[PDB]
Design a protein around this ligand. Sequence first.
Ligand SMILES: CC[C@@H](Cc1ccc(OC)c(CNC(=O)c2ccc3ccc4cccc5ccc2c3c45)c1)C(=O)O
Length: 258
Amino acid sequence: DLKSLAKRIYEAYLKNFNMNKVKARVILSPFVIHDMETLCMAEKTLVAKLVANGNKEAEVRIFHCCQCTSVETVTELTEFAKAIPGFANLDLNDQVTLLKYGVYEAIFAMLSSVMNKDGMLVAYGNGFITREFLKSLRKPFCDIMEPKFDFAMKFNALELDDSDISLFVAAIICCGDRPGLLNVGHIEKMQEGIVHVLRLHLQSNHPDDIFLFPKLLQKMADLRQLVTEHAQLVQIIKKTESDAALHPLLQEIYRDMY
Ligand SMILES: CC[C@@H](Cc1ccc(OC)c(CNC(=O)c2ccc3ccc4cccc5ccc2c3c45)c1)C(=O)O
């Protein structure tokens, strides 16, 4: 029954997220964006509407694309959350709170799947932007990217697959210590259930690493810190860059988070 639960989560993940580790890897083994010329060419083909004006600064244009991917992932994560035992039975306000505080942690966790030490896939697997090009961007835009790569490199070293990641993301969403929850007790039990499944699955899927579970619990805490830091950086950008507008949805997610 618990082995069945793990599969249900895995199937929901495969059905709700446009990208997964297997697909990402097939592609990585795509138009390359390594400089301004290639960035511009990529934009004209992939996000034509965004460069038809005559346009925002390259850094802001990239920042907008990053935001748009987040908005899309929020929709994917919301639909995914339904296959998690008990989630749909939670109060509507609790579901919203869980999604609000968990989306960015899940985003950076899953972002690792399309990242390697040299760069990352973008625009639904149709592009590959170099890590070095992202580092080249002027401050503070170049500071948004690198920390995510740093986390990704160590996360990817854990060699998790989609069956593991699906449960990890589920566990991230099922967090009882999120601010403003109405029914903390039911959420903690829901959490305990998912974490229990995650533990048994890692034991079965990774007999070679007896520290995998504790390692992942730590990544959960690392993600929370990574997000707090990301939120601060986004705030700095929002105030000091008069041309970088924040998407309304993300603005709502960011509100009173940290
Ligand atoms: C504003 C940051 C964002 C979170 C965030 C932080 C980091 C990060 O990759 C390091 C991504 C995902 N970032 C991306 O997916 C991404 C990056 C850079 C791009 C550069 C050129 C692009 C041209 C055409 C299409 C796309 C689509 C996505 C895309 C690009 C482009 C998202 C948020 O806070 O919502």
